[PDB]
């Protein structure tokens, strides 16, 4: 039951924040609805969920159009999959956030294809913090340069960082890796304006990510099922 699962997940986030001294409000729950039907998103909506994350462009665009044509206001849609250049226009025209800026050229494409009447597209720069086997995300050594270039693009708004750490079973390492992201995120925050989003943490490392300083966790299966 989606309404019940949403309650259980929000309770875990709330408990995790309180234990480490943070206010639960600091943690945004991103409900990841990739591969799940619109009817399931509609249940999450009827239960108060507003921010949804999708990974595949046409799947996400169809969902966005569906809920626009029902007139459901609110809703923030986050593109959290890898973005290839020949599908960037659909993202720039329909999505509210994109977490996967990992090269300047995809950012400038998004900037250029974003209609001027929409709000700036909120973007995070994706760090490959700990994953040998991923071609996604930049190294931390590249952050300052990419952030400067991206932050000039006027139809985008650089809001912080995202990372998908390598899968890790040890809590100690979950926290250390996440802390590395939190540190980079703080250092970014001193120099840049409106840095407020660390997209970090899924079901299995949720506690360490929150304790480390994440502002947003991405939960799919624990909400929608398998
Ligand atoms: C699929 C996905 C999630 C959610 O996955 P679950 O383990 O099913 O909760 C979170 N973040 C990203 C980037 C994803 O692709």
């Amino acid at each position: 039951d989606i309404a019940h699962n949403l309650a259980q997940v929000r309770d875990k986030i709330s408990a995790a924040a309180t234990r480490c001294g943070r206010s639960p409000e600091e943690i945004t729950l991103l409900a990841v609805s990739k591969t799940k039907p619109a009817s399931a998103i509609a249940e999450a909506i009827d239960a108060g969920q507003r921010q949804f994350g999708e990974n595949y462009v046409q799947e996400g665009v169809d969902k966005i159009r569906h809920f626009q044509e029902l007139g459901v206001t609110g809703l923030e849609w986050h593109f959290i999959g890898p973005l290839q250049s020949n599908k960037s226009r659909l993202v720039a025209e329909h999505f509210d956030w994109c977490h996967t800026i990992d090269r300047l050229r995809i950012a400038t494409r998004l900037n250029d294809q974003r209609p001027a009447e929409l709000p700036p597209l909120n973007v995070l720069i994706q760090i490959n913090i700990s994953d040998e086997n991923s071609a996604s995300g930049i190294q931390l050594a590249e952050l300052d340069e990419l952030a400067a270039a991206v932050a000039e693009l006027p139809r985008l708004r650089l809001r912080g960082l995202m990372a998908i750490p390598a899968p890790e079973s040890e809590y100690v390492r979950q926290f250390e890796v996440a802390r590395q992201m939190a540190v980079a995120f703080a250092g970014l925050k001193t120099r840049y304006p409106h840095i407020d989003t660390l997209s970090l943490g899924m079901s299995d490392d949720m506690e360490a990510a929150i304790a480390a300083g994440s502002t947003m966790v991405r939960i799919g299966t624990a909400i929608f099922g398998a």
Side-chain angles (χ1 to χ4, degrees), residues 7-223:
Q8 293 311 295
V9 168
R10 295 200 167 274
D11 284 350
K12 291 208 226 306
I13 290 167
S14 212
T18 303
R19 285 185 231 116
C20 66
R22 311 178 56 188
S23 187
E25 273 79 24
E26 304 174 32
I27 313 303
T28 298
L29 167 58
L30 181 66
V32 172
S33 48
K34 60 146 177 277
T35 85
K36 303 298 182 174
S39 59
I41 294 164
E43 265 187 69
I45 293 177
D46 196 50
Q49 186 59 25
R50 289 309 191 272
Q51 325 237 14
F52 296 92
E54 295 270 332
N55 292 76
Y56 311 112
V57 179
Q58 198 61 60
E59 169 180 18
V61 167
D62 295 352
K63 281 153 169 186
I64 293 164
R65 285 180 172 145
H66 170 84
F67 292 100
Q68 264 166 18
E69 293 312 305
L70 299 179
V72 182
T73 92
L75 301 192
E76 289 178 53
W77 295 93
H78 305 235
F79 190 73
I80 64 175
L83 186 47
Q84 48 202 132
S85 96
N86 66 25
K87 301 174 196 290
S88 68
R89 184 182 313 282
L90 285 168
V91 174
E93 296 182 357
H94 295 289
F95 275 88
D96 304 297
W97 290 71
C98 176
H99 297 209
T100 52
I101 303 302
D102 64 0
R103 59 220 187 272
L104 184 55
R105 180 135 35 231
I106 197 60
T108 67
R109 281 188 63 85
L110 289 170
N111 173 87
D112 292 346
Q113 302 159 153
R114 175 82 160 178
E117 293 73 9
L118 306 190
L121 172 78
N122 298 293
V123 300
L124 313 172
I125 287 169
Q126 171 176 9
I127 304 302
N128 182 351
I129 188 68
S130 67
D131 198 339
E132 287 198 328
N133 300 325
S134 174
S136 297
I138 62 157
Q139 296 300 302
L140 268 193
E142 304 165 273
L143 177 52
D144 285 351
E145 170 176 46
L146 183 57
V150 162
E152 298 293 327
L153 296 170
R155 303 284 72 205
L156 313 179
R157 200 179 188 97
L158 181 63
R159 293 292 289 277
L161 302 175
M162 187 273 279
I164 310 158
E168 174 64 74
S169 60
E170 296 194 69
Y171 176 87
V172 174
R173 266 288 285 175
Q174 292 179 346
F175 180 78
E176 294 179 328
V177 172
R179 281 296 306 159
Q180 298 184 260
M181 287 295 299
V183 166
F185 175 63
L188 208 56
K189 209 186 298 185
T190 67
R191 181 171 150 152
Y192 285 86
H194 44 60
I195 305 306
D196 62 359
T197 309
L198 181 41
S199 170
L200 184 63
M202 299 172 271
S203 288
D204 295 338
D205 65 338
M206 175 191 286
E207 288 68 27
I210 286 171
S214 164
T215 77
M216 171 184 297
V217 294
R218 305 184 305 275
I219 308 300
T221 293
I223 289 173

